[PDB]
Amino acid sequence: IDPFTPQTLSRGWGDQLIWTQTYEAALYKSKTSNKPLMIIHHLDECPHSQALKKVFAENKEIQKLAEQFVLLNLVYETTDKHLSPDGQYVPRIMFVDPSLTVRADITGRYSNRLYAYEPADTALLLDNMKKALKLLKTEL
């Protein structure tokens, strides 16, 4: 593509994680860097996502893929009108497809419920994170 901004002094790409908490800015720079973003959606109204956060921050697998991608940690409204207008169940993980949209093609065997926010979904979250991410670098 055309030269956007040359690197100098320090901070080359700054594409890791996101650093700042802003839904629109996160998704925006993701598309700008042609890199998919994974929106981690929490809630305060149920068992504090801090409990889940502990195991999340403890799971190497989840961090490894997320550090190479975007993680949009949002904690506000259990059923926000943007992701859950009609209400289905509290999320845990979400993913924005390169086409700036979402793809619900995830199916599974009945391990311990296929959709939860409780630390139980941490093993699934791993395999689900892969299916949700689908393509890593287009080539692979």
UniProtKB/Swiss-Prot annotation:
Tissue: Expressed strongly in trachea, lung, stomach, colon, prostate and small intestine. Expressed weakly in pituitary gland, salivary gland, mammary gland, bladder, appendix, ovary, fetal lung, uterus, pancreas, kidney, fetal kidney, testis, placenta, thyroid gland and in estrogen receptor (ER)-positive breast cancer cell lines.
Effect caused by changing H82Y: In RIFTD; decreased interaction with MUC2
Localization terms from the record: Secreted; Endoplasmic reticulum
A GO term for molecular function: identical protein binding
Family: Belongs to the AGR family.
Subunit structure of this chain's protein: Monomer and homodimer. Interacts with LYPD3 and DAG1 (alphaDAG1). Interacts with MUC2; disulfide-linked.
Disease named in the record: Respiratory infections, recurrent, and failure to thrive with or without diarrhea: An autosomal recessive disorder characterized by neonatal onset of recurrent pulmonary infections, coughing, wheezy episodes, interstitial lung disease, and bronchiectasis. Episodes of vomiting and chronic diarrhea result in failure to thrive. Results of sweat chloride and pancreatic elastase tests are normal.
Name of the protein in its database record: Anterior gradient protein 2 homolog
Organism per entry: Homo sapiens
Source taxonomy: Eukaryota, Metazoa, Chordata, Craniata, Vertebrata
